[PDB]
Amino acid sequence: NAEKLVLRIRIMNSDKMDDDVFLRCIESNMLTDMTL
Amino acid sequence: DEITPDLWQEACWIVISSYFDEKGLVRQQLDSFDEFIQMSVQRIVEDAPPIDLQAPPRYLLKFEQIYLSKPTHWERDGAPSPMMPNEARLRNLTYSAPLYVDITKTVIKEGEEQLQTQHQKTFIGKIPIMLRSTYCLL
Amino acid sequence: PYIKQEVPIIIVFRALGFVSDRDILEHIIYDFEDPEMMEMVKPSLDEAFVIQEQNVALNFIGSRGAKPGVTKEKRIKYAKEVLQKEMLPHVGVSDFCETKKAYFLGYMVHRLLLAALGRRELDDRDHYGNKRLDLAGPLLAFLF
Amino acid sequence: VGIRFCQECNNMLYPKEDKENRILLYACRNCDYQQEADNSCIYVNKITHEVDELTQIIADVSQDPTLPRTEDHPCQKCGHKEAVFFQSHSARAEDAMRLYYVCTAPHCGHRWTE
Amino acid sequence: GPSSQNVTEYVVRVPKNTTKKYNIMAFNAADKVNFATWNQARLERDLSNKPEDQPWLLRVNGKSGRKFKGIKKGGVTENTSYYIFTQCPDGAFEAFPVHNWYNFTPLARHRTLTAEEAEEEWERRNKVLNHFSIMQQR
Amino acid sequence: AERGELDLTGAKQNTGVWLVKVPKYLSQQWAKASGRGEVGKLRIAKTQGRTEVSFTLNEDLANEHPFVLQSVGGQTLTVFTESSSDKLSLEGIVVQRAECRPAASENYMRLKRLQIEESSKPVRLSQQLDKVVT
Amino acid sequence: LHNTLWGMVCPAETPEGHAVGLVKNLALMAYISVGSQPSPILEFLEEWSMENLEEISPAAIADATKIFVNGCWVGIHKDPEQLMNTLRKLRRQMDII
RNA sequence: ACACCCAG
Numbered sequence A: 001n002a003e004k005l006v007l008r009i010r011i012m013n014s015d016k017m018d019d020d021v022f023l024r025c026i027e028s029n030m031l032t033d034m035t036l
Numbered sequence B: 001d002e003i004t005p006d007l008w009q010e011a012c013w014i015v016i017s018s019y020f021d022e023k024g025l026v027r028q029q030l031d032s033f034d035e036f037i038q039m040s041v042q043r044i045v046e047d048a049p050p051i052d053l054q055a056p057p058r059y060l061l062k063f064e065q066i067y068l069s070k071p072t073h074w075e076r077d078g079a080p081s082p083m084m085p086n087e088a089r090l091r092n093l094t095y096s097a098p099l100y101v102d103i104t105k106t107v108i109k110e111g112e113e114q115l116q117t118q119h120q121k122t123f124i125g126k127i128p129i130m131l132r133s134t135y136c137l138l
Numbered sequence C: 001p002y003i004k005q006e007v008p009i010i011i012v013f014r015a016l017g018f019v020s021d022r023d024i025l026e027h028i029i030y031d032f033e034d035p036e037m038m039e040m041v042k043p044s045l046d047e048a049f050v051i052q053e054q055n056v057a058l059n060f061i062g063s064r065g066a067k068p069g070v071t072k073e074k075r076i077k078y079a080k081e082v083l084q085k086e087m088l089p090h091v092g093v094s095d096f097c098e099t100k101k102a103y104f105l106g107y108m109v110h111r112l113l114l115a116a117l118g119r120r121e122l123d124d125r126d127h128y129g130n131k132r133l134d135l136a137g138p139l140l141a142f143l144f
Numbered sequence D: 001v002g003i004r005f006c007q008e009c010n011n012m013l014y015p016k017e018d019k020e021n022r023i024l025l026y027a028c029r030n031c032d033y034q035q036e037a038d039n040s041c042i043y044v045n046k047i048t049h050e051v052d053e054l055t056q057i058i059a060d061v062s063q064d065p066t067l068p069r070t071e072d073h074p075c076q077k078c079g080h081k082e083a084v085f086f087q088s089h090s091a092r093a094e095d096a097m098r099l100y101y102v103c104t105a106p107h108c109g110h111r112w113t114e
Numbered sequence E: 001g002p003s004s005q006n007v008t009e010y011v012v013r014v015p016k017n018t019t020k021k022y023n024i025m026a027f028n029a030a031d032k033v034n035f036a037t038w039n040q041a042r043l044e045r046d047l048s049n050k051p052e053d054q055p056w057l058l059r060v061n062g063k064s065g066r067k068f069k070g071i072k073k074g075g076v077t078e079n080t081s082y083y084i085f086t087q088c089p090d091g092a093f094e095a096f097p098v099h100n101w102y103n104f105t106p107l108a109r110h111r112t113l114t115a116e117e118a119e120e121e122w123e124r125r126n127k128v129l130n131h132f133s134i135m136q137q138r
Numbered sequence F: 001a002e003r004g005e006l007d008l009t010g011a012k013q014n015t016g017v018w019l020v021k022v023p024k025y026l027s028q029q030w031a032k033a034s035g036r037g038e039v040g041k042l043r044i045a046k047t048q049g050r051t052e053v054s055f056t057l058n059e060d061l062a063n064e065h066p067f068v069l070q071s072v073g074g075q076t077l078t079v080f081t082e083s084s085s086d087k088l089s090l091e092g093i094v095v096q097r098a099e100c101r102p103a104a105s106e107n108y109m110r111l112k113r114l115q116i117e118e119s120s121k122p123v124r125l126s127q128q129l130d131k132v133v134t
Numbered sequence G: 001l002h003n004t005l006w007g008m009v010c011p012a013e014t015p016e017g018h019a020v021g022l023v024k025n026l027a028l029m030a031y032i033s034v035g036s037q038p039s040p041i042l043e044f045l046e047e048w049s050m051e052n053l054e055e056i057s058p059a060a061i062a063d064a065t066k067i068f069v070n071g072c073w074v075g076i077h078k079d080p081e082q083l084m085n086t087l088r089k090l091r092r093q094m095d096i097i
Numbered sequence H: 001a002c003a004c005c006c007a008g
């Protein structure tokens, strides 16, 4: 019922490439090659 | 005052008549060839770099104003004569005009003897001439 | 021209004299308020992270030329020659006409980023205002 | 939302994580400059691209002789009756067939989309 | 007050010849220069060529401070003129013509990748990750 | 104290200079005057909410010019000089930028056409010969 | 037949077969430009209020219109309304343009 | 060889 339909994603705890660009790279994977 | 709507048909065709009486039908061919001889050919000769020579004596061949004459034909006698456009079509001639360049030659040598000699209207070949242009005979 | 395979656009910007990223993006991005054009120039900056001087940028350009040099100064001089005399000759061919070249190359990418964003319509080839006609004037001057 | 440039080597800042305080830290990765920011945002992307076209319309378009003019829609903060209307007709705008109105009065670049 | 209707009216003077020639420092507005920090300035011609047709090199506060390169503008002042009006106790403005225009850009000081090192760095074309770690090795 | 040292004592005094761009006819008239001591006169007037700057030509030189200002915040300009003794020095920092325009709007065109004619005076075009060269 | 061939390329006259659409003819009033030197136009623009390209900073370009003479960027201007009114008047009077 | 051109 919220007007701002907010969905929150966070990475797993025990995580050489940093997470500042890993979360960029996986966000592109979610919106290109993921089937709902 | 102001062109009335019923008088516009006469007015527009008078305007077009003034265009074709002044400009013509093949004006794009003549204007481009006129700018080529009057402006472009002069610009190529000026933009061309001077010739430097060594081996000491030094020579500079500076180029100058282009002179272009009427289209002439040289017979077997070597006597020049103005080529007619009809004669070119008949005797299979080429309707070309001589191209004369002005060259100033300056010698550079030790001993304070820089002599500047000048050759007037050196013949450097013929250029085909568009008919009914400003540089044609007609 | 006179280069075999393609080079990144931030390399030739650093070869032109402006090496800092502030000077490069001031040449391309005229207003920094919009983030969209700054977003698509971000991958181009990441590709050119290796090159940091002007001289090494000239070395990278000359190493990919049609005539490979021998010494380091040989391909730098050759790359500076093609960066100056055969890169945008209509902007200017002179020893100190490099700021005008980068502004035009800044306008090169700025026209490219606007079309990728769709801010202006792509210029079609068959538009006849994008055409010129060679009459007997320019044709005979090309022979002469 | 926006990245400032380096005060030392005039390069572009980039996000970096620090373990001493766990705060956002824009760090230039060419030199060794350090900077703490307060925006706390790295990347935003308009997926449905609901970009406000009213800002990107140049206010000087109203004097184009090739654009239509109607007095049906008056200016809001200007009061002039006639105005210049057109469509954006650009990519990344979905339908891009809804009118944008620009007032034609001098020294009034007010644009409303209605 | 007097400043609301101030009447100031000064004389302009153009000297014929001057023992010193005048040029221009130009700096970017985003460079954020400060003249109070500058306790030492060194200006010399660069050694990249190895004279008058060479770019200028500006060194400020030695190697500790910032360094700049002066580049002459592409255009020429054939049809344009620039003059500087200098304040003087006598009040007669002295119009000084310019000789040349120089533009200055800062040079970053930090460890910079060698060209031989850069070619070894170029294999990882798009597979390069953690660009922070590139400067950690150097 | 060195040959390559730049003197910046003028910058420390906060000296203010004005950078002005003038047309060619004003510079040519000043050059033809050969620096007698006075070639023109400057008129500055300030109102309650607007400032106007104008330049008045000398009546001897002829036998008004507005100096509308420009934004200075775009760049940082300072002026320096080099001497015949190779002593680099700086006068000051440019504070206000000005530009000059001719007052005539429609009658100025006849002077411009003569300037174009003088500019096209030394240019050459290929002539025509009535007779072939022998 | 593109939309911009109105008035200077004949929409009717075109040869048949392999050459159709590629060999075109001028209209009755079409006049191909002969060319001119861009020096008087560039001299007029620098005389006017147009600022030079190297003179400006790369920050005032956004609120100004770029000037292109023969496809070469030569500077910016801040008053485009007065510039077109001046340039079009000078072409109609045939003074310098 | 190239241009131009006829027919569908």
Ligand SMILES: [Zn+2]
Pocket (backbone or CB within 6 Å): D006, D007, D008, D009, D010, D011, D028, D029, D030, D031, D032, D033
């Ligand atoms: Zn930095």
Ligand SMILES: [Zn+2]
Pocket (backbone or CB within 6 Å): D075, D076, D077, D078, D079, D080, D103, D104, D105, D108, D109, D110
């Ligand atoms: Zn309004």
